Design a protein around this ligand. Structure first.
Ligand SMILES: [Cl-]
Lengths: 243, 231, 241, 250, 244, 240, 235, 195, 111
């Protein structure tokens, strides 16, 4: 054997074991989710409070790309940052040449091709992150999830990390119970609940909630962080549901 | 085992062993402590010597008038990273006439360390850094790890037996955070914190190394007879 | 045995990495089919959306390479999209350099040559995909050309790809033995799509709803994919006969 | 990133063997039989069209390829490797000769250039040898008609007649009995078809056999008139019908 | 990364030998024998073709003996493809020298440069060496008639008579026995053929399995002529010495 | 470009590639250097398994780097040519910029530097060669003899030998060479050099090469008969 | 095989650790720093008696105010010295002043880790860099291939280093004169050396503010050796 | 730099080269040797742009000396002249060409014949019985056409050369401070100290 | 054609005493016959008790002062906070200026 020692090597199955090993690093990471709504998207993430010494609200994990796209990820945090840095370069060169801000499907492929490129050679390592991202463009709202292999699809809801299965189950219920659609302000509240429910799979250390959102009506199509009263309102909603 | 030959290889459980071995170099390094209030930020570092005839390895490096760090692990790697920080702080000043934010400083270090963990041939940095600074949003303390992970904290410690000082700061959190407009008392708290990581050896005049930055205080380092006050 | 890790010859004159790339082709567990009419070329593929959370509109293995050329892929989506982007760029550059739309068979050859390079050069791995290109060429008429990881390519009267490819292949073979011709003798593309779906149903032995299929159609001067309602309309016609 | 394979993947073993070349020759052995026969007034090259599927159109896949108007090529082994060699062989005929001398290269020199390309794949960094053996038939004014074989090593040999691939051992024996120095082109085509029937198993007709000649000039295939010195290509691919005519009087 | 698959072609063994060079020499030892004999009034180059087939075109063939310029020729032993790469380089080097100095290149200078190229492949670049041994036969106005040999190591030496390829041990003993310094070309022709005839692995030595060439001053007055023997000319010289 | 680090450290602190390059030197034919009061003599072994050689055209073992400096060697012959070429170029380059020929120490230092560079450069192996560099500095009558080796270290020697069975001939020179009184004349120096080679060589026929270098670019190579006279004289004195 | 810039499980670079083993095989070099100057001494260690020992150059001048002693694979030190000399002269050109001993050492140590897959391996040589400047006065540095340098009051490197270092621990005090330091280097060298110490197989040097860096003659060292033997017999 | 002459006679080549080095309105030196020995039996005189002349001459000298050491053999004057021409032929299409004109006087030991080559900065080579560069030729060529014979001795060549220098000293505008004369023959190169 | 230089006028003056030194300069900035600023300082404290002024083309003058100020900063980093002597600063400035020998800073510098 030895097929798993090098990246870009096909096993006799037709599999790239190095990419599958990168997925294990993603599964080890904290829970992050994405919820598509009526006129936008909502992102949320679990931040494990390792110590009292961590400054609250000052270790921001969700990242903005351009002014209209939000990105969140689970797994190796530095690898995620590298991917977002690339995303920003891709989005900048698109706007430079074509004037209009990069569409979300267009942006999704730019990351997809970049991550896929890191499965082509043995001189590079696959990305150790699954990235949930999306935003609002001319064609409306889009939510995507990108994996170490370079595989991505559009999603109604998306989840990844240690509590992905708990979050996926909770996401599936929302899709069933809301066929006509979910509102932006509702999706923020739901996002909080799902993170709190997904925290049951990581309950040794207590955690800190972080939410962001893009909405055509609520945020005027731009990416913003949920803070202050709207954040505390979402936390209280989540606290009430676990009890 | 079979997956630790280079940084480009993942283990079956999704681990990067070369990055973990680089992390191990920090644990062997001498203890250093970081802590801050709202007005000032302090670095305290236990320096290490080869023998009685040798000097004590300098742990603290200045990056700008408002920023600097302490190191633990491979000193040459700290020199490379601190030099990079000096250039980035300097680029921010020349081009934008703007003091570099301590948060951006961390982001830049994270991205520089990351590139070394995804490419063949290179190696991870073998050093941990505690960056302190005072910028437009007040005092700051960062912890850099060569995996790429940077974390903003009220207080922390890295190196050998750093758990003792880290526990102390976790207890003292409410006290030292409110030491505002009083440099000497914030240092005292940091010196008492690093003392919880000592075994058999005590803090002497050419052993202790302290640095401070704050509201009306540029980043300055204290060594020799200047730290005799705090023993 | 490092001769099985990179693209160099084994003692028996084989490239195991190329052979294993062929097995990656069936990783998605999707069967595709392509046939030619008089005026058109129709390609159909299974569409499997297992996760309920997925946006089904974004789940696709058919690509519009140029205005005239379409491409369906059998294999993992990252490699599929990799091939799709390259083919689009190649088709665009061809038009710019040579002043006319890149033919289907020329694009197939170009992508096949690229695939060949990966089988000879060590640092590049083969793509684990089989690319089926379709168009109505202005010189050669209705065209089906298929590429694989080995760098092999050839024109087809009709073709099928996937896990149950052989069952579909013989089903089509037996039809062309009977009809005595190289194509589907049919005027409208609508009925050629109906033929394609009907013969896939017979070969695979499964029934299809509107969301279980994905259809691409090539006519003169344009290639286009069908919506769910376009396919549903097509499924109704089959059931009513 | 970047191609880090700057070292040879083909190296000498203790016994003195170049493993990858030997293994490339093994791949050629597995390949379908092809042959070439040289006559007094022409050359014939032929091979079986092994179809991957009956749905596949075997006309689109050309095993016999024109390199120059007076030079043709056929192979045994890996088809994709052959295809890219033909592309490189056609281009090198222009870049390293026609663009310099204003005329097409003689057979031996074009063969030499192809051999050079195949040799480099044997020694250059991060590549395997080509998994094919070529048979190159051609004509030029000063050397007349000629037939060459080119191996994965980059070695080439001129032949009166030969065969490569699956049933080459038996085919070469058959050609030894039938070949003489007084053979006319039509006689060589007849012998080629006889030799090839032995190795072919399934259908044997103009649709499953690919055969081309290097013979007289073809003014009708030139595409224009007005220049007396330009008399047309000596390379001609025999049609499916033309083959079947000769299979009746077999 | 790619380190895993590197053969490391340019390294020493514990004994201080170059693995790849040694294995390349082992390869060459299975190649058809080539003999060079230097006489007072010329040089002979004789070489045995590798197991010939009856349908091989013999007259329009070149496997062993190659012309570098009007005054210098080489006999090859090993991979032919490798040899042709080196031959074209040698041909170009000779023309560079002529272009620069308006004088034909001295034999040793050409040999040294070609040997220096081989040396390079054993010390750096990570590539396999050229699996080729040459016998250089040439003339210049400094040293007159000269025979050299080079091998994959890039080491070259001068000779009065020398063999490369297969059965060199047996061949060198026979040459050492019958060679003498006041020898003529016609005598050297006979020695070359007799040596091959005894060391050959074939049943009997025939015209179709040989390549032959001479470098005489047999032209008209103080000038050198290269004669690459035709098939019929080899047939005649084989009968004339009483081998067939 | 080929980058591989071929020369690297081992757990015990050795660079095996450099040490294996020394084994190649140990395989090479013996070479000896002896410096007298007003001269230096370079002796060299030539193995006698090679008959039917052409000694006119065969590369000589001792090479002139400039008109006043010579270089002999032991080890891989092909490798030695590269060092000699580089040294010859540096010799002319020094004359061009400094307007003065190289000192023997400088030329040695350069060659040694080249050998060292190949011990910590990527993609290359060390030179399988040790050299003896001898000559006289410009406008100087003090004899110079230096030795280099694959690692890159170099040093000056009153007398030294390298190559196969060099430990035997070094043993001979260590008791026969007096520091307080070196060979006063050319004849004495050549004789001691020939004597030392006769401990190892076999026969004193066409196996020994001798090259004598004297001050002010006075270098000459001895012929067979001239060397044979020393061999004949030494053997007659030995039978005692 | 394995990467050149690889970490061990303990968190050390394999190649750097292996180069340190090569340095232990090297000949002994000792340095002692005083308020009157810095002394540097080395074991020459000739491999054979025919080798002219005066050509063994293991003590080296970098500038007038900075000297250098080496131990290990001494051939590797040539490019380090070349760099140091250039750095020292270049700084004088840019700033019209002598360069600090520490700054010079730092410049040399920057080369150390510039290896990988830059040069192919670390240096197999340790350096003792001694000098003087106006700011920090007389200084002695130990530059390793790890890229690390420590300042020392006294330091021994090479095969007899651990034995010599233990001896320097006891003998060194802050009021040592230059003459006392010279004898102390000779004393400790004679203890750890295999062959018997004399003027031909051992070499002394020093750096003073007044006269700069000077390598001692064999005549001068011989008298210090004779003075040393007499003083030990005197009690 | 200004006056360089060359005369090939029966058994030797004689090169004469002016001693003056002028910059502006000042004769900086009056004892300059405008020649370099390329090999024991080959001598090259030069004239042209300041700096370029010596830089080129020494560069050629180094290359020829390198060849001599490598092969332990002296290149023929014909071979050296061809090498020099090629270097100038490269130079003329460079970013900054060597503006140097040369005469190469040599004795071929294999042919036992003297040889004189005239090469200008463009790389224009000609073998001649007598040669000159610059304005010198406008006087000396017609003079030598008249007085030169092919079978002359070295002494006759020197008298013929004196006749040229006298004519130049009479009719040339600039003071070139006399000439350094050198002879190239079978015994090598030597300088005439009293001219 | 684009002319990369300009003249911003003004004048500067440096005098040295026994235990002190002055560096004066007017605060006027001009182009052609127009006044740009009545108060635009061009005499700067560069640290280590060194004052500097680069008068002429202001853009080049500002760039130079900016580079020297930065040179002082890095001198401290690289040489253990050593004070840059006036003579050392002068030599450093020579290299800054001569570094652009073939596209000069059009300024008259005084420290
Ligand atoms: Cl192509």
């Amino acid at each position: 054997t030895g097929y798993d020692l090098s990246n870009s090597v096909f096993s006799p199955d037709g599999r790239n074991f190095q990419v599958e090993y990168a997925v294990k690093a993603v599964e080890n990471g904290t829970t992050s989710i994405g919820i598509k709504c009526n006129d936008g998207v909502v992102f949320a993430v679990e931040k494990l409070i390792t110590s009292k010494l961590l400054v609250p609200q000052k270790n921001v994990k969700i990242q903005v790309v351009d002014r209209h796209i939000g990105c969140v990820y689970s797994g190796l945090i530095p690898d995620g940052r590298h991917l977002v840095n690339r995303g920003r370069e891709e989005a900048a060169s698109f706007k430079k040449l074509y004037k209009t801000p990069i569409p979300i499907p267009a942006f999704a492929d730019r990351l997809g091709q970049y991550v896929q490129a890191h499965t082509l050679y043995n001189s590079v390592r696959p990305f150790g992150v699954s990235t949930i991202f999306g935003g609002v463009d001319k064609n409306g709202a889009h939510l995507y999830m990108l994996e170490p292999s370079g595989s991505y699809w559009g999603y109604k809801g998306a989840a990844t990390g240690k509590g992905r299965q708990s979050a996926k189950a909770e996401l599936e219920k929302l899709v069933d119970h809301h066929p006509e659609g979910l509102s932006a302000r509702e999706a923020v509240k739901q996002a909080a609940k799902i993170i709190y429910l997904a925290h049951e799979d990581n309950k040794e250390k207590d955690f800190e909630l972080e939410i962001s959102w893009c909405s055509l009506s609520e945020t005027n199509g731009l990416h913003k962080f949920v803070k202050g009263d709207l954040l505390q309102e979402a936390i209280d909603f989540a606290q009430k549901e676990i009890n | 085992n079979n997956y630790d030959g280079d940084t480009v290889t993942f283990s079956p459980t999704g681990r990067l062993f070369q990055v973990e071995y680089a992390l191990e170099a920090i644990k062997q390094g001498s203890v250093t402590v970081g802590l801050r209030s709202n007005t000032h930020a302090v670095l305290v570092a236990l320096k290490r010597n080869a023998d009685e005839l040798s000097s004590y390895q300098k742990k603290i490096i200045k990056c700008d008038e408002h920023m600097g760090l302490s190191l633990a692990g491979l000193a040459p790697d700290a020199r490379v990273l601190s030099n990079y920080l000096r250039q980035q702080c300097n680029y921010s000043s020349l081009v934008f006439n703007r003091k570099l934010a301590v948060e951006r400083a961390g982001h830049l270090l994270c991205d520089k360390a990351q590139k070394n963990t995804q490419s063949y041939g290179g190696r991870p940095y073998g050093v941990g850094l505690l960056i302190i600074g005072y910028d437009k949003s007040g005092a700051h303390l960062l912890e850099f790890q060569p995996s790429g992970n940077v974390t903003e904290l009220y207080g922390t410690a890295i190196g050998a037996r750093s758990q003792g000082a880290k526990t102390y700061l976790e207890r003292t959190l409410d006290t030292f955070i409110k030491i505002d407009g009083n440099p000497d008392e914030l240092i005292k708290a940091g010196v008492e914190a690093i003392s919880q990581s000592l075994r058999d050896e005590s803090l002497t005049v050419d052993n202790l190394s302290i640095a401070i930055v704050g509201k009306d205080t540029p980043f300055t380092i204290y060594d020799g007879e200047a730290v005799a006050k705090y023993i | 045995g490092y001769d099985r890790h990179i693209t160099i010859f084994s003692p028996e004159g084989r490239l195991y990495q190329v052979e294993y790339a062929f097995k990656a082709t069936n990783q998605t567990n999707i069967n595709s089919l392509a046939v030619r009419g008089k005026d058109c070329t129709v390609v159909i593929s299974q569409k499997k959306v297992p996760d309920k959370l997925l946006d089904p509109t974004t789940v696709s293995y058919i690509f519009c390479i140029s205005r005239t050329i379409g491409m369906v892929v059998n294999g993992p989506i990252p490699d599929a999209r990799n091939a799709a982007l390259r083919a689009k760029a190649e088709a665009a550059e061809f038009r710019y350099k040579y002043g006319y739309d890149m033919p289907c068979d020329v694009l197939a050859k170009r992508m096949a040559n690229l695939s060949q390079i990966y089988t000879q050069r060590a640092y590049m791995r083969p793509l684990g995909v089989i690319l089926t290109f379709v168009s109505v060429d202005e010189e050669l008429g209705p065209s089906i050309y298929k590429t694989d990881p080995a760098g092999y390519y050839v024109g087809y009267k009709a073709t099928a790809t996937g896990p149950k490819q052989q069952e579909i292949t013989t089903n089509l073979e037996n039809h062309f033995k009977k009809s005595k011709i190289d194509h589907i003798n049919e005027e409208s593309w609508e009925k050629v799509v109906e033929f394609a779906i009907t013969h896939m149903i017979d070969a695979l032995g499964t029934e299809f709803s509107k969301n279980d299929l994905e259809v691409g159609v090539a006519t003169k001067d344009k290639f286009f994919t069908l919506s769910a309602e376009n396919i549903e309309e097509r499924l109704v016609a089959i059931a009513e006969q | 990133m970047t191609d880090r394979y700057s070292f040879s993947l083909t190296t000498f073993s203790p016994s003195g063997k170049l493993g990858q070349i030997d293994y490339a020759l093994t791949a050629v052995k597995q390949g379908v039989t092809s042959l070439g026969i040289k006559a007094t007034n022409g050359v014939v090259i032929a091979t079986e069209k092994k179809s991957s599927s009956p749905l596949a159109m075997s006309e689109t896949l050309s095993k016999v390829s024109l390199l120059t108007p007076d030079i043709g090529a056929v192979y045994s082994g890996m088809g994709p490797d052959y295809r890219v060699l033909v592309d490189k062989s056609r281009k090198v005929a222009h870049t390293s000769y026609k663009r310099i001398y204003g005329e097409y290269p003689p057979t031996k020199l074009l063969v030499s250039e192809v051999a050079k390309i195949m040799q480099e794949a044997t020694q250059s960094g991060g590549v395997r040898p080509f998994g094919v053996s070529l048979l190159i038939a051609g004509h030029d004014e000063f050397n007349g008609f000629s037939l060459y074989q080119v191996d994965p090593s980059g070695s080439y040999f001129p032949w009166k007649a030969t065969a490569i691939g699956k049933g080459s051992v038996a085919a070469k024996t058959f050609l030894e009995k039938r070949w003489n120095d007084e053979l006319e082109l039509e006689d060589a085509i007849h012998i080629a078809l006889l030799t090839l029937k032995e190795s072919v198993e399934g259908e044997f007709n103009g649709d499953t056999i690919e055969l081309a000649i290097i013979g007289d000039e073809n003014p009708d295939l030139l595409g224009y008139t007005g220049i007396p010195t330009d008399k047309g290509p000596r390379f001609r691919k025999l049609t499916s019908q033309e083959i079947n005519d000769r299979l009746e009087a077999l | 990364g790619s380190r895993r698959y590197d053969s490391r072609t340019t390294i020493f063994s514990p004994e201080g030998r170059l693995y790849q060079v040694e294995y390349a020499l082992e390869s060459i030892s299975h190649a058809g024998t080539a003999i060079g004999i230097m006489a007072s009034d010329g040089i002979v180059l004789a070489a045995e073709r590798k197991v010939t087939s009856t349908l091989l075109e013999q007259d329009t063939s070149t496997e062993k003996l190659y012309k570098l310029n009007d005054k210098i020729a080489v006999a090859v032993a090993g991979l032919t493809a490798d040899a042709e790469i080196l031959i074209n380089t040698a041909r170009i080097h000779a023309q560079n020298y002529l272009k620069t100095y308006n004088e034909d290149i001295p034999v040793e200078i050409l040999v040294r440069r070609l040997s220096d190229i081989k040396q390079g492949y054993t010390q750096h670049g990570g590539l396999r060496p050229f699996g080729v041994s040459f016998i250089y036969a040439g003339y210049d106005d400094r040293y007159g008639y000269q025979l050299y040999t080079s091998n994959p190591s890039g080491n070259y030496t001068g000779w009065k008579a020398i063999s490369v390829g297969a059965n060199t041990s047996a061949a060198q003993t026979l040459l050492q026995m019958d060679y003498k310094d006041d020898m003529k070309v016609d005598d050297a022709i006979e020695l070359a053929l007799k040596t091959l005839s005894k060391t050959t692995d074939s049943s009997a030595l025939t015209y179709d399995r040989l390549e032959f060439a001479t470098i005489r001053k047999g032209a008209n007055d103080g000038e050198v002529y290269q004669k690459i023997f035709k098939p019929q000319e080899i047939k005649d010289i084989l009968v004339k010495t009483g081998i067939t | 470009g080929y980058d591989r680090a071929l020369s690297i450290f081992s757990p015990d602190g050795h660079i095996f590639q450099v040490e294996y390059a020394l084994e190649a030197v140990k395989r090479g034919t013996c070479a000896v250097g002896v410096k007298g009061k007003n001269c230096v003599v370079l002796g060299c072994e030539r193995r006698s398994t090679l008959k039917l050689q052409d000694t006119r055209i065969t590369p000589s073992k001792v090479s002139k780097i400039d008109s006043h400096v010579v270089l002999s060697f032991s080890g891989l012959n092909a490798d030695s040519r590269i060092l000699i070429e580089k040294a010859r170029v540096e010799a002319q380059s020094h004359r061009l910029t400094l307007e003065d020929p190289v000192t023997v120490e400088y030329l040695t230092r350069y060659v040694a530097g080249v050998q060292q560079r190949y011990t910590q450069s990527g993609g290359v192996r060390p030179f399988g060669v040790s050299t003896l560099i001898a000559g006289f500095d410009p406008r100087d009558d003090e004899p110079k003899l230096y030795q280099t080796e694959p690692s890159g270290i170099y040093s000056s020697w009153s007398a030294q030998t390298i190559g196969r069975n060099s430990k035997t001939v070094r043993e001979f020179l260590e008791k026969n060479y007096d520091r307080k009184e070196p060979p006063a004349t050319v004849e004495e120096c050549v004789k001691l050099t020939v004597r030392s080679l006769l401990e190892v060589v076999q026969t004193g026929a066409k196996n020994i090469e001798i090259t004598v270098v004297k001050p002010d670019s006075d270098i000459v190579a001895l012929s067979s008969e001239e060397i044979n006279q020393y061999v004949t004289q030494i053997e007659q004195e030995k039978q005692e | 095989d394995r990467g050149v810039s690889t970490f061990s499980p303990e968190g050390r670079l394999f190649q750097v650790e292996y180069s340190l083993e090569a340095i232990k095989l090297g000949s002994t070099a000792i340095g002692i720093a005083t308020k009157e100057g810095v002394v540097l001494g080395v074991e020459k260690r000739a491999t054979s008696p025919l080798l002219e020992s005066d050509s063994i150059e293991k003590i080296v001048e970098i500038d007038r105010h900075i000297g250098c002693a080496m131990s290990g694979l001494t051939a590797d030190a040539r490019s380090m010295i070349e760099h140091a000399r250039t750095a020292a002269v270049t700084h004088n050109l840019y700033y019209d002043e002598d360069i600090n001993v520490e700054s010079l050492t730092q410049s040399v140590c920057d080369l150390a880790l510039r290896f990988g897959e830059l040069m192919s391996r670390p240096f197999g040589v340790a350096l003792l860099i001694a000098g003087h400047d106006a700011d920090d006065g007389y200084q002695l540095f130990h530059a390793e291939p790890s890229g690390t340098f420590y300042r020392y009051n006294a330091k021994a490197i090479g095969s007899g280093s651990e034995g010599a270092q233990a001896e320097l621990l006891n003998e060194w005090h802050s009021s040592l004169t230059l003459k006392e330091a010279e004898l102390l280097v000779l004393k400790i060298l004679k203890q750890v050396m295999e062959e018997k110490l004399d003027e031909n197989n051992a070499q002394l040097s020093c750096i003073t503010k007044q006269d700069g860096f000077k390598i001692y003659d064999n005549e001068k060292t011989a008298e210090l050796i004779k003075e040393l033997k007499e003083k030990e017999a005197a009690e | 730099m200004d006056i360089i002459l060359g005369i090939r006679v029966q058994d030797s080549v004689i090169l004469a080269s002016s001693k003056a080095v002028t910059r502006g309105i000042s004769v900086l030196k009056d004892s300059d040797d405008k020649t370099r020995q390329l090999s024991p039996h080959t001598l090259m005189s030069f004239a042209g742009e300041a700096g370029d002349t010596v830089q080129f001459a020494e560069y050629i000298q180094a290359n020829i000396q390198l060849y001599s050491i490598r092969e332990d053999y002296e290149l023929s004057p014909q071979a050296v002249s061809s090498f020099v021409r090629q270097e100038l032929a490269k130079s003329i299409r460079s970013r900054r060409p060597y503006q140097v004109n040369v005469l190469i006087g040599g004795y071929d030991k294999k042919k036992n014949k003297p040889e004189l080559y005239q090469i200008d900065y463009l790389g224009t080579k000609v073998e001649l019985p007598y040669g000159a560069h610059g304005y010198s030729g406008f006087y000396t060529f017609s003079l030598l056409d008249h007085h030169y014979r092919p079978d002359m001795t070295t002494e006759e060549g020197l008298d013929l050369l004196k006749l040229c220098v006298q004519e130049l000293e009479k009719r040339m505008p600039m003071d070139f401070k006399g000439v350094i004369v050198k002879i190239v023959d079978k015994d090598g190169i030597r300088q005439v100290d009293d001219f | 054609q684009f002319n990369p230089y300009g003249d911003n006028g003004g004048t500067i003056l440096g005098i040295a005493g026994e235990d002190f030194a002055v560096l004066a300069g007017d605060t006027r900035n001009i182009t052609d016959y127009s006044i740009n600023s009545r108060y635009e300082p061009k005499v700067f404290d560069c640290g280590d008790n060194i004052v500097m002024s680069a008068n002429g083309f202001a853009a080049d003058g500002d760039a130079l002062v900016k580079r020297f100020k930065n040179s002082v900063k890095w001198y401290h980093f690289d040489h253990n906070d050593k004070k840059l002597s006036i003579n050392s600063a002068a030599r450093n400035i020579q290299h800054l200026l001569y570094g652009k020998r073939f596209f000069p800073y059009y300024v008259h510098t005084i420290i």
